[PDB]
């Protein structure tokens, strides 16, 4: 497998070797850097730790500089691990350019969703509003909590709370174009996240 | 298969066998004589 991680920019609207539009999301992938390589004999599993976005040193800290110093790079902001990849191909200090991907390949995209805040059950779970006339006093509410006999409410009864902030994949997307000069990927379709938010791109698990 | 607690043979060619702890009747000639308990 493979992958990178990058920053969401925004949406566009693109023509692909024909007049057929493709809506597109822009991911800026300033070249990721390997920092650590984990193996079974020391760490329990094969994996590779990666950093994306350079901090200022005043924002970083000593024990992070010490972790970056092996690869001989600058303090990174977002740090993540990639699993189920070849370790003989990758080394500490290696820079992962966007050239790794080929326009057209199928891809999976993780991101943290836009915070919607403390929301009701209707918006949070698609529940239906009660009637708004005919004497109804039941408009935006989640309904009964359950039967009588348990004398208790069953779990996963869906209610109001924080909507958003969750980690979400989108599978079976497609890479539309690459710009290594600009370090940009164009991905067919919407993806989870606010702008200036982290995204992880990976080769598809299903494909 | 004829699943019935009153398993008992229907012709002379029926054999009775306890198979996986269940009683069964097996006739090669007539498979309608095939029976089981349940």
């Amino acid at each position: 497998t493979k992958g990178i991680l990058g920053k969401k920019v925004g949406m566009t609207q693109i023509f692909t070797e024909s007049g057929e539009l493709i809506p597109v999301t822009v991911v800026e992938a300033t070249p990721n850097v390997v920092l650590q390589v984990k193996t079974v004999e020391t760490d329990g599993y094969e994996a590779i730790q990666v950093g994306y976005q350079d901090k200022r040193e005043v924002l970083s800290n000593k024990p992070a500089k010490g972790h970056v110093a092996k690869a001989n790079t600058a303090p990174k902001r977002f740090i993540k691990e990639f699993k189920n990849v070849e370790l003989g191909e990758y080394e500490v200090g290696k820079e992962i350019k966007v050239d790794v991907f080929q326009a057209g390949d199928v891809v999976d995209v993780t991101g943290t969703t836009k915070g919607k805040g403390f929301q009701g059950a209707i918006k949070r779970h698609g529940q239906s509003r009660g009637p708004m006339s005919h004497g109804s006093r039941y408009h935006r509410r989640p309904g009964s909590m359950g039967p009588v006999a348990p004398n208790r409410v069953f779990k996963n009864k869906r209610l109001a709370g924080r909507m958003g902030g969750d980690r979400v994949t989108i599978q079976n997307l497609e890479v539309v174009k690459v710009d290594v000069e600009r370090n940009v990927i164009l991905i067919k379709g919407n993806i989870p996240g606010a702008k200036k938010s982290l995204i992880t791109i990976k080769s598809a698990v299903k494909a | 298969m004829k699943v019935r607690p009153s398993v008992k043979p229907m012709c002379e060619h029926c054999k009775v066998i306890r198979r996986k702890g269940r009683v069964m009747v097996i006739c090669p000639a007539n498979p309608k004589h095939k029976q089981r308990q349940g």
Binding site: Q13, G19, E20, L21 | -
Partner: protein, 122 residues
């Protein structure tokens, strides 16, 4: 976005003048239709000396809609009225001459006779 109890004009000479959607076909809980989607309907207003007459239950095809259609290239068609064409079990029409324009989306759904009989196909 054509629903049950939604009224439609008629775009052929079959005999009908106004139509009311009984149900949409396709699936179990389809609550909506657009161009290329077949309809089951009544006839609320018919031409007087018409074959198709008041009260008859009949199938139909949506040919143009305000909530219109979309193309791969972002080109979208829309209309100022919701109209339909009455058909038989086969995709062929009851009448003989379609009025007004028609969307291109029907050629994929194999209403080719209606596409031909229509004067303008957008």
């Amino acid at each position: 976005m054509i629903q049950q109890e939604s009224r439609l004009r008629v775009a052929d000479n079959s005999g009908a003048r106004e139509i009311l959607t009984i149900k949409v076909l396709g699936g179990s809980g389809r609550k909506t239709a657009n161009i290329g989607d077949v309809i089951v309907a009544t006839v609320k207003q018919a031409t007087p000396g018409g074959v198709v007459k008041k009260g008859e239950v009949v199938k139909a095809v949506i040919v143009r809609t305000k909530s219109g259609a979309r193309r791969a290239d972002g080109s979208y068609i829309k209309f100022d009225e919701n109209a339909a064409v009455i058909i038989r079990d086969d995709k062929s029409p009851r009448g003989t001459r379609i009025f007004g324009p028609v969307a291109r989306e029907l050629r994929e759904n194999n209403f080719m006779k209606i596409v031909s009989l229509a004067p303008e196909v957008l």
